[PDB]
Design a protein around this ligand. Sequence first.
Ligand SMILES: Cc1cc2nc3c(=O)[nH]c(=O)nc-3n(C[C@H](O)[C@H](O)[C@H](O)CO)c2cc1C
Ligand SMILES: Cc1cc2nc3c(=O)[nH]c(=O)nc-3n(C[C@H](O)[C@H](O)[C@H](O)CO)c2cc1C
Lengths: 87, 87
Amino acid sequence: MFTGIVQGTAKLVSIDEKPNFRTHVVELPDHMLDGLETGASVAHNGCCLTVTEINGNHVSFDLMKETLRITNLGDLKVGDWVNVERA
Amino acid sequence: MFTGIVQGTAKLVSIDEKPNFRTHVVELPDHMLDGLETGASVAHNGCCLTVTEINGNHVSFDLMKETLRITNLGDLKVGDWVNVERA
Ligand SMILES: Cc1cc2nc3c(=O)[nH]c(=O)nc-3n(C[C@H](O)[C@H](O)[C@H](O)CO)c2cc1C
Ligand SMILES: Cc1cc2nc3c(=O)[nH]c(=O)nc-3n(C[C@H](O)[C@H](O)[C@H](O)CO)c2cc1C
């Protein structure tokens, strides 16, 4: 799915804690928005996540508790930069 | 080459700045050491790097100027945890 050739960084502009998961909103680079549809896989810091929503260059993903515990995505704070790569 | 199923996190234990490049030494989880050889590829926060050295659990990578520029790996500090996945 992924080459490990990161295409750029994206700022975490938002974290919604909901009852069973977290939504991360990231601001993607313009050159990554082209042809991006909901359901597409983007790896965040190497972790595969599914696009749930697109508002402009603001892209949403839903993170389960297991993803948060196994990876460092549990420790991000708003304003952090994540490596991003579409598949 | 990578699936984006992160296999775990690795502590950045050492950063050795040189000319141009920068060596990162990370402490890999035990279950990732088996069969790991120099020249092998591991994605660090989604960024594919080549194993340059293995000493116990301590795995070295050399990070080139472009990699530091495109990714967030330039901002890491000793003690940070990185997502890691072997190919
Ligand atoms: C195609 C694909 C899509 C995935 N999408 C998500 C997701 O939206 N949210 C999530 O928490 N995990 C997702 N995962 C699992 C996530 O990548 C995995 O839990 C972490 O990498 C920890 O191994 C996905 C995995 C694959 C293979
Ligand atoms: C098989 C493979 C091995 C790579 N090894 C390294 C490496 O050892 N050091 C490095 O700085 N970049 C390496 N890269 C490039 C690096 O992944 C890339 O510059 C960043 O992901 C930013 O796109 C490699 C790329 C591939 C595809």
